[model samples]
Target: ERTFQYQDSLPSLPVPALEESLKKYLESVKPFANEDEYKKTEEIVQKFQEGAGKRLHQKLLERARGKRNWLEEWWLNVAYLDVRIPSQLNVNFVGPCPHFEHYWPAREGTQLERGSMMLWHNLNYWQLLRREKLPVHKSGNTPLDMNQFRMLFSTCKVPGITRDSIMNYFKTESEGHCPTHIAVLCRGRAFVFDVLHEGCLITPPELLRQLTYIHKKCSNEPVGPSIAALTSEERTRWAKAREYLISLDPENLTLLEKIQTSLFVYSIEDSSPHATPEEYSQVFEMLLGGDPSVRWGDKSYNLISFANGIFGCCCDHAPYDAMVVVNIAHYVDERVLETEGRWKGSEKVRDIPLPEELVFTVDEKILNDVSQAKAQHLKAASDLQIAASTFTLHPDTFIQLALQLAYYRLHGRPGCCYETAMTRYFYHGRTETVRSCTVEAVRWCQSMQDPSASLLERQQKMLEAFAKHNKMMKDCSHGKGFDRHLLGLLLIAKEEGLPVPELFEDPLFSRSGGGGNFVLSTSLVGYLRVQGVVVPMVHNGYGFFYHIRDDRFVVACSSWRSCPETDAEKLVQMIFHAFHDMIQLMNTAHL
Candidate 1:
């Protein structure tokens, strides 16, 4: 039952063979490149494989032999830490709560009460993890990394000039001290209080009392200075603003640290501010950009409770991936359902300490920064159009295939796609970029588009495409993927102050979606009650995420309206049609 029992015994993240890596890389490049372009790229890869690439690959191998997971630090910096963009939208996930699906559908006034129960259940989950009572996750006989579980709570990504840092203050029961407090954000003001009373977990009645106090006080007063929006600033700027706040007063740092160490952030909003809102779409938008004034984008988890009684979470993607959030979300959703969304315990209130507002001392410069941050966030929010359409799944790869088909139908080409392939089997691993738009998938798309193709022919080609995609995912799961390994070699060359290699400088490299230029960005998010959406990797690209249910599929598709080349609505419709067509082929055609 010990969560860390397999920490020392688990296998290391392996570095794949260089020849195998280059062979796979070239194969991926073919569908996106022309004959001449492919030939030019081929020469570059051949030369690199014969000389420069081998040296860097050797360096990467040497580096891997010294560490359990060599790519962990490099991946962190390259994917998250060093990025200068505003992380609130780009680096965090905005999601809808699963509660609306079952016991408590959207309504009114239950936010405070339901929110309290939500906090209670989350606290129990933290306790379960800390005490090592939570079961270790495994795939058949192999244990997946449980290290991410330690980051689910008490973790925050602090912005920095060159690189951001993750602050985690959690400790297991036997190790030492663990923070048991929770922070609440409302009307742009922050409040924090302990979840523990007299060294024991506080009951819901006491939690409700504290939440009600914060809710009433905020409702009555004028809104606080939108200090929380300051987090929405670009990482470097936010880092500077934080340092500026620290210079303003000593108490500011103390208050900020109080929040940084809290179990998790609880964010409350009146409702979505969309002038004319769609019930389904607005929930996701609100969870994402509705009120940055109250959402701490850096917190690992923001348990957002809307005034309309809907719920969601805004999660920092730096400390961990969405799968970690999914586990706790599913855990708590079941907890609330078991009680039928009502607190069934004793109504007696305990002498729990009231939550204290974390009032920051800020001047006009910081206030101006906060104003600018909120304005930029809103502008970006409006530029990104989200369309929510429900209706499909065959374990992720199928939707990936459908999305590929969807993109092909809309744009009339094989759009380069990136699907997240989890590397959790390795210690502290997150994802290896998986190209869903394979040659096999492209071939099937071609045949499907042709008029002469029969049902049997199309079905057989689709099956071949599915098998190829499935093998790619399974190979990636065992840490045999080339993307990260290639990344490691490139990073080593840069670290050694060498010139840019021709293989990387080739035009086909970027054309093949090598440097994260994916046009159809998507994630399966697994088959669960949970659903979420992230900002697109490229301005012209689309952000699509979904979680499957038995009867319906919950989907969130996003795209930049500013990019006239793409339309989110059209993509959603095509995706739905793709789902319909593929299911028909499966049901009607013989293999």
Candidate 2:
């Protein structure tokens, strides 16, 4: 409970008035519904606000009063853990390894050595969390949630039928029982080595010694079975396979526990070299793509070091969101750049024990399951097409407006979008969906596409749209977003076993991309060169992630090939055109 000292003093997750929610809901559904459909939804909203909605709202308020963060557990379960899809490709964030500029330049046969340095730096970040010494993240002087940082190490998400639970072995340094071992994966083999000896984090030389041993063995020995691929299977399928695996031998269960409970995963990857920025971007596909055995999908965080010294990460989304990892990556990147990737301390290697290999007991049945997992993961990962481009304008606002334009160009209407706004400013906070499809946005999108629209008029609407988006995002970050509050009410009704409200049952809810079906699932992966993205939450949707530099914008967009209406390449091209047009309009207006 000490982990959440600030939680009690923080204000409760606000329960918005039913009338306000209904009004907002109506405005959100306009782009997606016809006149007749919207009229029917309006009636449903009216009935709901006057009837069962009042009771649900009251129950939500009562629930909030009893807890500081009423939406915490419920949001964890519903928004993430409750979904049964395979988290690897469907939910996890995938991004290129941070590019080392001076100290650890990409080179052959240096992966293990560079890996040790990276790991040592990462260990320090984890240590800061243990000491609670890391400064709290803030936005314009407002503190954001630091709770997600606690789950970055020594944590795993255990799947269940109805809800998944996160297992975190984190403790303050004063508590002194935090696990100190790191799990290493190489050629489908798993190893565990203690990084803490004599009450201190092992030095880079000591880490290098352990990694060198594992690397030698994995390189010369016969390939191990790709059992890690089982994690890439469907959730229920993996659960059954996991059960079968454990029942095979008591030792297997022990091995599983060790991997699940380790401090974090260290993946010794053997990947092709990438030299350029575009080439480096392909590392996202390489790490996120082929050879599932190298990645353990359920681990809270996996740091992958390629054979050529490139590094990348894959993480489970259940325990925490991407911003937590991004924060750590930014810190490490800055440190690495500052020190030029060379360890300045003593070169002496400690007398630490070598890493112990963790072998699983599996038969033909498990082998076949692994085979199917690889096949499925490959096919899904292949279906994803990504395009990276740099734009000279204000990236965050430009891409969002470009997306607003792209979806309208494609479907002749505004795309119901979800832009993740970090709510860590609040205690134990994660994120809230900042819906980007404001009435102002839709109007601006329409005006931009209309040939007769005046430049001044289009610019006016565009500025209004940007203003609305900024306010909404700020409101969400302040813990006053509409999505989570509405979710609270819906969950309360569900917990009471009441009939699902007609408001939620209205055709508009799902059709309008309410209930986690937003067509554009996006996040601004910060101003750093590092960026990552996930598959769209819905088949018809697009997954968008972008990073803004001083003069250019690097963006990645992903869409399913199976969906006929949505094309990743076409959408990206349209986004580029939309960007060009907007810039032209601005330049013209400035004259």
Candidate 3:
């Protein structure tokens, strides 16, 4: 078996002056500084960490206790994230680890010290973050959230949620939130790079440990009963809870609230000894070991893999968008060629070191905030109505499922009447030299929503609403859009004299008619040859997406929920159908 050996003379890695820099950076990002939200987040994360953290720590310690190269080899083969799976983030290889297939460069000897190099690599990595808007999937039908959820479902079974019962419930709820289970693998340093953008790789391991600690540790949450198995009483309660959830308006409901309710039910299941936290650590490490390709399949990825080298990654879209993945990949490619004594664009790949930026680990406190964010989000739920649902169809099917739902609602299939559009402002502004002023357009099929209505009426009104909402969102992206829109909506509600409640708590809270979401959540689920293992895979892919005929309102959701086939084909079909339907009502570009 391959093993890693620590440098006898620790290399001088470039580390960032995080103590000083973060103090300044936090100020500019103060607006997004949700104190109450973060406090709650901490509480929730800490609960799990405490329950399972020590056990996980013990397992890691035991695994490494007396190994010759414990630090390098002991934790090499383990799962990546076992605590909880985030949405649309199924690509397992992410974060920083040096022993995996995709390990980051270690600055052994250079002008930069290990600490400074760590900081420099990390800071410069953020430069790749795209300021323009962008969506993960190239196909217009799906968005990032759907993909993230799909992965979570595929890999994880929420605590208290039974593996079997959850599967049974999946028959219905799966279509709406169809994340059955994820086939996660072991952890490796290279796999970590696969998940995080190269520039964003952690340099000073302490920074990573600190960041993770802040995100995962610092919390004070109440320990609830461990619900491992269901009792007769618990079953009845679950039934009641389902009914309560079902009764709520999907459009107006806060999803995070729904998640909280689900978790609560899980906690109440039974007092059985469930899997320990170390199991989660092992699970995560195993998932990471599954594949480095699935996470980052760029040029650097290919070259690095070819050279038998390693890489790692990390970040959120709020600040650094997905395109950072591409930039880092290219950077890796340059470095690999230069290392082998070959000149690419430049002879030298530049003298840079790994960055030592601190990351705040998630704890029970952070999770409490997720619950809190839901509570805070609900304050506006009663303000509007938005209905959403899921529909499961024959195995290996598509338009048929959609058509059945359409006919059931409208007594007949209204010719396709919605268009799912991709939003990628980042691609337009890949380099700082480019000025991306125009926001990505939102396309839909208004002509199809109401066929009998006067063409002029349909054309004019739909355009008005679409333009109005899209522009509002675009402005919001530039900052203060949400604030401006909220105020405008409030004014309109007051002027029109609509009953706008202060908080919407009735469940599926939304802002419009109660039918489907404005977006239909869809994804392709499958498996690929990842990391020498034939692991099950899903290519978060989607295509033509549009709204259903519902009381003159529009709601649609589409993305890859299952990738049995190639993502490109399935995604294209979905997008083209929506575009075709829109053209039927009004002529538009074919492409």
Candidate 4:
């Protein structure tokens, strides 16, 4: 495959001009700042760029020159690795597999049956990745960095103190050896086994045999120690807990390696907690942290199969973004559509080896810790409020504008908003922030709020808002976004042991959502069958994710029930009306 011909030669991510970045930074904060407040902030920005900022940015340039992607290590650490909160509910995305919307809808006692087919189709995708036969992903003619696909399988995030590490065991056929085994999680019990017979990938029947063996083993049996709950615990605590697990028995670490290095995890549930397919809110929560014992939060991929025939996933965000998972998931969806969720070939139960249960030896303290972790996880998971709704084409910018309007109307203020702008055009690229609440956005939102403003006035401002958003996205995707550039400077100061500068210390920094405090955290999953949910960046924030179909829109929103200031349901309704009003404004202004 000539795919490797493209992968290594991709251009390095470019750093935007310092002055250009600072100009954009000021514009981003305008909607959220008062004139006097903005004046103070502008003065500070002046001082920093002339004094400390120029020097810090020069150091950042030196760092960029030294590496192909200067921010890779820093981005990983600042964005995910060093986050101390539990990854289960906070950092990771729990996607409600949308196959049911088309073919594999709810059915009874069908977990192992349909799930087996998914593994077969899923591994076939892995086969493509291994052979590099899957055409290289590209934005226009430029190739996207394909490194994240390598981490899709055979990868797990290991807990550590102060930071966590991603462990990946994947290697292509020509690249040498890699893990061929798989892991299963049931009733908090874990199982690991080889999925390859000699040099060949196993059939669906063989997969059925493997899944059925584990499924029946846990039937009517007491639930396992819920040690998988330990994965749901706080990052540092889980790290320390892992230390104790290792000390208790040498085999524990080996078992952990088997679990971590396996192709992926299969979380099987005898029954789903949600009664209907329409209950996406409950489905999202359940997929995220529903059965921690069954869903290993740290594993790069946990393909969950419920007894009700519904499937979903809880995946670590550290390895890659949703697009990688969405790409494979879309592959599996097409396969399912082709096969009608049935295994067509031979059902002859070959002499496939049964999966081995990794019976972890543990002390009372470990058991106690597991119980405590489960309790906290359940309570926190239950406290989350989810709202599923609908809204495309230039729809990404349009949706951002609608969100700006929705949030402003609801909160009575312009909330700093973060929209994901992918930088995959470069080598080792991930995402850059597009601060959505701009001055043009606020002006339009405010215009829409007033009955006196004619449709022409509203449309004019909306056009400006859309244009501003469009420009920001194009710049961000090419790695010219200011938020990340600002962070680069901040982290340089941090890493260099310099004093916390007044530029960063300004109240406007966080008020403008500079340090991950955005009141609206959003991303357009694009026009795909894929749909997922994420917790908000702040407790009072809203996580708004959506995908627009050719005919309709599907959105999933989340807010903490514990935060009285935020309501997911209310915000979603406002967005719906906001969409209608924008459409009305455009059509009316035309007539």
Candidate 4: which stretches are off by over 4 Å? 273-279, 391-393
> Total backbone clashes of model 4?
1
What tens-digit string does per-residue lDDT give for candidate 1 at 466-487? 9999989989877888999888
> Candidate 3: what lDDT?
0.24
Model 2 accuracy (lDDT, Cα):
0.81
TM-score of each: 0.97, 0.95, 0.27, 0.98
RMSD of each: 1.9, 2.3, 24.2, 1.4
C-alpha lDDT (0 to 100) for residue 83 of candidate 3: 16
Q: Of 3 and 4, which scores higher on lDDT?
A: 4
lDDT of 1 at 280: 75
Q: Say what the RMSD of model 2 is.
A: 2.3
Displacement of residue 463 (Cα, Å) in model 1 is 1.2
Better of 2 and 4 by lDDT: 4
Q: Which pairs of residues have clashing backbones in candidate 1?
A: none
Better candidate by TM-score, 2 or 4: 4
lDDT of 2 by residue, 1-591 (tens): 333455445555566676876787788788777899989999988887888888888888888788767888888888778888888888888776565545665789888888888899999988877887787555665455567877899998766656666888877777678888989989888899988988889999889989999989889887788778888878888888888888989889888888887989888777764745544546667766757887888888988888778888899988888877887888888878877877899998878888898889899999899989999999888977665555553457677988899888977878889998877766677788888887888999989888999999999999898887877777787776778877787888778788778777788898777887898999999886778888887888898888887877778788888888888768877888888888888899996
